[PDB]
Design a binder for this molecule. Structure first.
Ligand SMILES: Cc1cc2nc3c(=O)[nH]c(=O)nc-3n(C[C@H](O)[C@H](O)[C@H](O)COP(=O)(O)O)c2cc1C
Length: 351
């Protein structure tokens, strides 16, 4: 009866409902290592046939810009993620690992040898902001990547995709949104390169398309999604022509025949052109209510809807939605704190 709670077939996966766990950075993977507490967390949010996306997961030793976000670039990361994946599988979840590199959204304190964060350009991020006291930028201005270094970062994503499979994930979500490394190349206010990776829409999408290319070759395009936010400007990532960026990307990922395109809504024409252009599954995110999502599903505006904050705060979100029970309030001050339990796995199920 309830459109959000109607099954849906995502390529070769059968989903019981359309209520997806959005990727949610929780900063509790000590030392970039996934922790057994995450096994409880994602397990609590699993339903048979539910689709879950992990928090963003680093592709390399320089992919990090916050403390305690997990990697999947070492054999060690692989082994620690296995029991988390298995717990999700035990309750019948389809579980995709979202893979990112923060690029310029970082500092020397997060980089090996204390070196500069890397980006498509050397454009400094929030220059008005310094750390407590020192006249020193909070976001250590980034090093512009040599074109000789770009294939060996695009390979970093190919390899993280490989290690996701090793850990047993069903698939991978490429984090091409929110002002991080992939979005940095795509956005015209950030990418001012005068080589083949910059200086034009096509040049600017070369990077993401190379990444999609290498991941889908590694693991199969049928296990590959990408997240885009062409309309956002998180971390100074706005585009002067966001409708064009969006359409060119959605159109351009058709060639590759990947599984899904997952897009964050603007401040609300926008998502539709991308949806009609992209032939596979479409996932919409950003400020959905139950009723917003029921409506988007029934009117064919999207196939799935990712909920981030409400799902964070309600381990049984899909059930609650099935029934319209009241939701737990989300406690913002513990989104990003570092306790294994508090504001992480102590949001309650329905009495
Ligand atoms: C605590 C917090 C962490 C997040 N971490 C990520 C991230 O790892 N990757 C990502 O693509 N989006 C991230 N998001 C965005 C969510 O996936 C989602 O798009 C956003 O919360 C808007 O959806 P909502 O209205 O359901 O909360 C995060 C959001 C919050 C609140």
């Amino acid at each position: 009866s309830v459109p959000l709670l109607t099954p849906y077939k995502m390529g070769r996966f059968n989903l019981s409902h359309r209520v997806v766990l959005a990727p949610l950075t929780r900063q509790r993977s000590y030392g970039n290592v996934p922790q057994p507490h995450a096994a409880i967390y994602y397990s609590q949010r699993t339903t048979p046939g539910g689709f879950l996306i992990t928090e963003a997961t680093g592709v390399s030793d320089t992919a990090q810009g916050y403390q305690d976000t997990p990697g999947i670039w070492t054999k060690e990361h692989v082994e620690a993620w296995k029991p988390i994946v298995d717990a999700v599988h035990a309750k019948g979840g389809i579980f995709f690992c979202q893979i990112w590199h923060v690029g310029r959204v970082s500092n020397s304190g997060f980089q090996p040898n204390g070196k500069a964060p890397i980006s498509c350009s050397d454009k400094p991020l929030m220059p008005q902001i310094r750390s407590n006291g020192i006249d020193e930028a909070l976001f250590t201005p980034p090093r512009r990547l040599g074109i000789e270094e770009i294939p060996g970062i695009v390979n970093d994503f190919r390899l993280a995709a490989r290690n996701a499979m090793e850990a047993g994930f069903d698939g991978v979500e490429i984090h091409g949104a929110n002002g991080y490394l992939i979005d940095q190349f795509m956005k015209d206010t950030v990418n001012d390169r005068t080589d083949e990776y910059g200086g034009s829409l096509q040049n600017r999408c070369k990077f993401p398309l190379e990444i999609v290319d290498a991941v889908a070759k590694e693991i199969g395009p049928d296990r590959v999604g990408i997240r885009l936010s062409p309309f956002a400007d998180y971390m100074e990532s706005g585009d002067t022509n966001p409708g064009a960026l969006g359409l060119y990307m959605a159109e351009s990922l058709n060639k590759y025949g990947i599984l899904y395109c997952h897009v964050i809504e603007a401040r609300m024409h926008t998502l539709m052109p991308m949806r009609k252009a992209f032939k596979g599954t479409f996932i919409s995110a950003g400020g959905f209510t139950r009723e917003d999502g029921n409506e988007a599903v029934s009117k064919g505006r999207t196939d799935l809807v990712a909920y981030g904050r409400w799902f964070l705060a309600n381990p049984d979100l899909p059930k609650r939605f099935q029934v319209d029970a009241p939701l737990n309030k989300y406690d913002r001050p513990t989104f990003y704190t570092s306790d294994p339990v508090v504001g992480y796995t102590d949001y309650p199920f329905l009495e």
